[PDB]
Design a protein around this ligand. Sequence first.
Ligand SMILES: *Cc1c(COP(=O)(O)O)cnc(C)c1O
Ligand SMILES: *Cc1c(COP(=O)(O)O)cnc(C)c1O
Lengths: 386, 385
Amino acid sequence: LLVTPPKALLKPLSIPNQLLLGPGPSNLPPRIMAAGGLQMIGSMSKDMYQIMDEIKEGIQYVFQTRNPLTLVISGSGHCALEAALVNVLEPGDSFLVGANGIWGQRAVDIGERIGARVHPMTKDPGGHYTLQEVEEGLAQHKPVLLFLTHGESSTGVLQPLDGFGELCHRYKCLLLVDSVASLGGTPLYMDRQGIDILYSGSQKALNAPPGTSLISFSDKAKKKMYSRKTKPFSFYLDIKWLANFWGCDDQPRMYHHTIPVISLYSLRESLALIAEQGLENSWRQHREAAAYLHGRLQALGLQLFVKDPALRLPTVTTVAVPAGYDWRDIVSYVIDHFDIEIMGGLGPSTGKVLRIGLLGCNATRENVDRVTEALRAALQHCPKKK
Amino acid sequence: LLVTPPKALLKPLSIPNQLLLGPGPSNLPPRIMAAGGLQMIGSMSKDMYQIMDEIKEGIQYVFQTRNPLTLVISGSGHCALEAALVNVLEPGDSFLVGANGIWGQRAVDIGERIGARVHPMTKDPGGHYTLQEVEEGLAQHKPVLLFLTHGESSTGVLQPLDGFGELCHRYKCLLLVDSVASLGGTPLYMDRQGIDILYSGSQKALNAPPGTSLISFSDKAKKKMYSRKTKPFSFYLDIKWLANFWGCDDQPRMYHHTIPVISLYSLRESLALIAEQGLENSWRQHREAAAYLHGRLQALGLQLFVKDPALRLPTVTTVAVPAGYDWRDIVSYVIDHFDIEIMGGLGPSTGKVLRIGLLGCNATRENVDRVTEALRAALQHCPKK
Ligand SMILES: *Cc1c(COP(=O)(O)O)cnc(C)c1O
Ligand SMILES: *Cc1c(COP(=O)(O)O)cnc(C)c1O
């Protein structure tokens, strides 16, 4: 045998106990861990289809939509974004992008790759879009689709959504919203707000393991995806196939790809947990936990990166890196000494911020206090330039 | 609020006990279940990178490769196939496909979608490709890439691989092989056999949960993917990003997408298990379990769909549907009365076969006895036209 058994693999798997207070992934509550330890069932079994049906109802609840074209993407949040774009956008389609952070930037990248005519509305980290800014782009660029990040987890910004769907429809444009970091943590009403494509991820406020994502499409979006004269560049993400297998159309469920059965157990449990809590209660929990964190951070002498409180994302808080410190020193101090994960910035916000997440079961006073004391220590014991 | 908490979600999760003896997914051994119940760690933590590095070594062992561009794809077997094609193939590229079952048909579909000029070598289910046939395709079509299914789990066929790599390389063609169903169950030597892109999946003989897949690229494949004139149509599957995050290039890892941490625990344990068993021992187990199954099926009067034993895929056996029965009756009887899943056909083998999987820890004479007993009962209780 060219390759002999790797000796590292003959040792038991061991993992450290880490408090994940970054922008994701989040820690798992006991019920979600327990679901992930269950035995397999047939991936096209009646029982699996029931679990899928229940997850669909759970997505319809947390998104606040009655869209029948609602399902799980078998991939991370990026995969759901790519699924939205590859199905909705044909080569040459005008695509307007709220490029105010890494997520808009990734939407630009995907749009470019799949041949769309991409028109970024570029903003610096911390920026957000007004209706007038969006209408100017809608008027100048005549897009079939607008992408807006709801929770800009790379900058800590909460993008208002009211009226954007209506405005987009007046220009015959579809509204696609990224709610990966916002879902569960802040108000979101898919149908009410006129959103045509809404997606989120498993590992943020829902506290499920990463690797699955949630997506829903309005009838307007469905029409565009089913009317195109080219096939999408992806088979794995082809919505006609996925809609069928997820029981959204008029035909028997056909084999497309094997869904991640065990991850669906855990995703289903994560949707049950928030259905038990109640959406509005969850919003309150995150709203109150973030207010408390904001106070404790400012009492340390730290400056919140988003200056307008109304624009602050409860689930991911950006903090200006204090003068004289290497943000990497602070972040490593906190994990190295306290087994607490926080993060620096990402894309445009790199070097400029620290990012602290309050996600689902982790959005608690106790965790605010732990991260507050960790930063207090890091500020006292990290090197500060002379 | 428009939508109230779903009543069904307020009930507790409850799963039936099923013995999964179809072509996959397979049942999970204790260590893999235990790993699935663990707590999260940072998706970009040093400890996560260690686990990933160990997984990479494990893939290099089960594939028998030293290729540094070896990693996990964050999606099912299909996703690994798509990752291979969207990175290797550029619009206009000639793509020669072994369409002898569903998996070649799927490769055709992906290739068409991404603008390749696709050349299927279409073969009836149960067929396999000779060196002569492929060279005729290489002669005619001058492809940049050949797709061949190793373990054709829709037809039960074990495709010979020796000599195909050397042949493709003479014709400056890359060899892409699907080993989702063969990995761990039958001999496979990526580097020895000159395979340029090799992929498998988590939920076949490895007995990990479905949702991840395994992929490796040779230096020749890397050269193609890294000298494209256009970016791949996929960002999620762009190999330059993926190679970097998986520590395969000479740059520090940068965030691409969040890897499925818990699934990686489980895959790690699945690779540890087969590392503990030994590849050749795994091949032995599957070979002997399949031989036992073939004899028991034949004793029932059932006919094996692949007649040459040398061409039978140990991990997924095709049985010709017995004359006079509705195969759906048999499949239903087996789950309803014996809590065993088997399958009918898929793609070209639809309606023509039953499919019985023998996968990893499930590949046992006990399970052969269980499915044989259940089939015996189905043949005498299912109505016969
Ligand atoms: C975390 C995140 C993503 C990316 O999700 P992945 O699971 O890493 O692919 C996308 N958008 C937002 C707002 C996010 O917070
Ligand atoms: C099961 C299988 C696949 C596809 O795997 P999925 O996880 O269902 O996407 C591809 N090739 C072969 C040979 C398979 O057996």
